[PDB]
Design a protein around this ligand. Structure first.
Ligand SMILES: CCCCCCCC/C=C/CCCCCCCC(=O)O[C@@H](COC(=O)CCCCCCCCCCCCCCC)COP(=O)([O-])OCC[N+](C)(C)C
Ligand SMILES: CCCCCCCC/C=C\CCCCCCCC(=O)O[C@@H](COC(=O)CCCCCCCCCCCCCCC)COP(=O)([O-])OCC[N+](C)(C)C
Ligand SMILES: CCCCCCCC/C=C\CCCCCCCC(=O)O[C@@H](COC(=O)CCCCCCCCCCCCCCC)COP(=O)([O-])OCC[N+](C)(C)C
Ligand SMILES: *[C@@H]1O[C@H](CO)[C@@H](O[C@@H]2O[C@H](CO)[C@@H](O[C@@H]3O[C@H](CO)[C@@H](O)[C@H](O[C@@H]4O[C@H](CO)[C@@H](O)[C@H](O)[C@@H]4O)[C@@H]3O)[C@H](O)[C@H]2NC(C)=O)[C@H](O)[C@H]1NC(C)=O
Ligand SMILES: *[C@@H]1O[C@H](CO)[C@@H](O)[C@H](O)[C@H]1NC(C)=O
Lengths: 253, 93, 101, 50, 51
């Protein structure tokens, strides 16, 4: 059902019920669509028409499926309807065969979800968090409409989707359809070391690591000057590419 | 992202109220005041990205001209249906 | 008077005026410049000059925390983290029209 | 007949049709869904071979 | 043949894919903060973008 969009599949069936009714109205109201059943007695008062309401529906379905039927309209008032519906049913089918011959030769593997918004709705794919870590603390205190609905699942599904460790959480993704939520830096470490995982979505929160000093220390300021020096000359990005990378991944088809 | 820098509330050199804003900003990040403001100013118009997203199925934007030529055939046929009924009634006279 | 201004930095400062007690006196810089070290004299120009000479007191603005600004003025924590990204046109479709069949 | 009913099944599967043309609604649904069945088989045979 | 050459086509995704194709032109603010970054960088991708 994929090569035509679901808007088209409704618009074809509405046109299939539409043109069938219009061909019924014209053929009953045309003077040249009137035959005789058995012409041994060529008289009047036996004159009838073949286009019933069931037959007019049958010409619409029968011409759409490239099999035809046996009505074969006679007057010009009905052959234009039978002439444009036959041109309509080629362009539908020769675009269904052409588009399905584009799926089966070029396969773009899509993902079901792209963000937390697309994953806020589908409760089939299970949520997840570190048990009472920094991620579970964020969704408990948040007031955003998306992120409060994500907490409505995890409050109802404690000891079901709430794993207590990262090593058992990555394994739970490795077993079932699990959508574990954790910090972005460790995901950039696991995905580069596992070619069966990925990071879908951007960032939810925005925090940062920091070199801790005691309360009111003078050497807080010198490290503050030092870190910004190494960010401009690119020392940290040469280190972040040294540790979080280490294996260029594949995938080819 | 290519680089990773940040904006900051500037204070004079060695100011005491650098530390109070340092405590203040981190309070508003946890209760989500800044993310309600970042969604207030940088948004403001929901775009059309869900309308196509490359549209990997044929739709009205790609095939919908066949419905126009279908409708143009039915309108032309009714104008024949009026015009052919009058041709027979003229023959009866 | 002190009601000309509106935006993200204005909404930030009102919450900073709420939990931290003051009444703000927004005042535009004369240069209209962020801040950079002028080479021929070493004299800073823009917002960072008013922060050194104590003419202004806060610099709630898109003021990027960098190395050369850290040794002359002192910043707070980053309230917004950004980076360099690529701005580029969306793929142009195919322009099918409606009679593309 | 039994031979004709077998002939409508083969004759509609090969896109050539036949001459039976069922009349009542009880049989046109069978003739209507078998015609939709024989497009999706053939238009997936042409598409996969392409 | 139309619907499969349109499907197979993929645009650029990163600076690494845009470091190679010199057909699509690069760009920067003249002597801003972005142009200052590529002038001082030593990364293999970002130095070729400055070239
Ligand atoms: C008598 C009954 C008439 C009823 C009509 C009432 C409507 C009900 C129809 C009913 C048609 C059957 C069901 C299909 C409906 C599906 C929805 C659909 O297709 O919408 C489509 C319209 O396409 C249309 O369907 C409306 C076209 C009206 C044309 C009327 C004939 C005039 C032509 C003159 C003949 C002159 C003769 C001279 C030559 C001899 C939407 O397409 P679009 O948005 O418009 O395209 C813009 C493209 N874009 C989206 C990328 C920007
Ligand atoms: C025995 C027979 C011997 C003679 C045979 C030759 C006779 C030839 C007689 C008539 C043929 C028409 C020629 C006139 C020129 C067309 C220009 C026009 O104004 O059309 C208009 C409408 O038309 C359409 O909707 C588009 C399709 C073109 C019309 C052809 C339909 C063929 C039907 C076959 C029927 C069988 C003919 C039965 C004849 C009784 C232009 O459309 P539009 O406004 O630009 O669309 C708007 C789209 N939009 C909203 C997205 C913007
Ligand atoms: C060659 C093709 C063009 C030519 C043929 C055009 C045929 C007609 C045009 C359009 C009809 C086909 C689509 C139905 C409308 C859309 C509904 C839909 O999306 O699917 C629905 C399924 O339900 C069905 O699909 C059953 C309908 C199939 C056709 C039955 C014969 C009707 C023809 C008349 C015979 C009557 C006999 C009368 C006797 C006088 C929804 O379910 P789903 O979405 O699949 O769920 C899976 C989710 N997933 C897909 C995301 C995985
Ligand atoms: C393509 O993508 C698939 C996504 O689902 C992927 O995953 C496999 O999916 C099947 C079913 O969808 C899994 O099969 C069962 O899943 C249940 C969960 O209810 C598991 O308990 C069980 O997996 C086992 O788990 C054991 C740990 O307790 C482990 O030791 C076993 O070896 C076994 O994996 C069932 O097998 C299946 O687990 C999913 N994973 C794997 C690795 O198969 C497909 O594998 C993937 N295919 C390819 C070719 O890439
Ligand atoms: C990924 O998982 C599959 C099983 O689904 C396994 O055969 C394969 O070895 C794993 N690793 C890679 C790199 O594909």
């Amino acid at each position: 059902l994929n090569p035509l969009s679901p808007d088209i599949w409704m618009y074809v069936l509405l046109a299939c019920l539409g043109v069938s009714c219009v061909l019924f109205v014209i053929a009953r109201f045309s003077p040249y669509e009137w035959y005789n059943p058995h012409p041994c007695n060529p008289d009047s008062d036996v004159v009838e028409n073949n286009f019933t309401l069931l037959n007019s529906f049958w010409f619409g379905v029968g011409a759409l499926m490239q099999q035809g039927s046996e009505l074969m309209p006679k007057a010009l008032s009905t052959r234009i309807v039978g002439g444009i519906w036959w041109f309509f049913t080629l362009i539908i089918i020769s675009s269904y065969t052409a588009n399905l011959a584009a799926f089966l030769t070029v396969e773009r593997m899509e993902s079901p979800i792209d963000s937390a918004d697309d994953l806020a709705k589908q409760t089939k794919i299970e949520y997840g968090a570190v048990e009472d870590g920094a991620t579970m603390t964020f969704f408990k205190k948040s007031k955003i409409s998306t992120y409060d609905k994500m907490w409505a699942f995890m409050s109802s599904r404690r000891q079901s989707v709430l794993v207590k460790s990262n090593e058992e959480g990555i394994q739970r993704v490795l077993t079932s359809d699990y959508a574990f939520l954790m910090e972005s830096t460790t995901i950039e470490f696991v995905t580069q070391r596992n070619c069966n995982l990925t990071q879908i979505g951007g960032l939810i929160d925005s925090k940062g690591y920091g070199v801790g000093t005691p309360m009111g220390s003078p050497y807080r300021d010198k490290i503050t000057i030092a870190i910004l020096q190494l960010q401009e000359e690119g020392k940290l990005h040469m280190m972040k590419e040294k540790w979080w990378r280490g294996n260029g991944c594949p995938e080819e088809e | 992202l290519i680089d990773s820098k940040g904006y900051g509330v500037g204070t004079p050199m060695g100011s005491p109220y650098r530390d109070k804003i340092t405590i203040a900003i981190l309070q508003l990040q946890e209760e989500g005041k800044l993310h309600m403001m970042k969604e207030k100013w940088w948004r403001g118009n929901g775009c059309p990205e869900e309308e196509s997203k490359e549209a990997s199925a044929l739709g009205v934007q790609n095939i919908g001209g066949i419905f126009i030529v279908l409708a143009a055939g039915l309108v032309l046929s009714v104008f024949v249906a009026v015009g052919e009924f009058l041709y027979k009634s003229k023959k009866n006279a | 008077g002190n009601d000309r201004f509106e935006g993200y930095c204005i909404d930030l400062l009102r919450e900073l005026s709420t939990i931290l007690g003051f009444t703000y006196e927004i005042r535009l810089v004369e240069d209209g410049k962020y801040g950079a070290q002028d080479d021929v004299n070493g004299q800073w120009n823009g917002m960072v000059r008013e922060l050194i000479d104590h003419k202004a007191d806060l610099a709630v603005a898109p003021l990027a925390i960098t190395y050369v600004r850290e040794k002359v003025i002192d910043f707070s924590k980053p309230f917004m983290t950004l980076g360099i990204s690529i701005l580029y046109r969306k793929p142009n479709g195919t322009n099918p029209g409606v009679f593309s069949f």
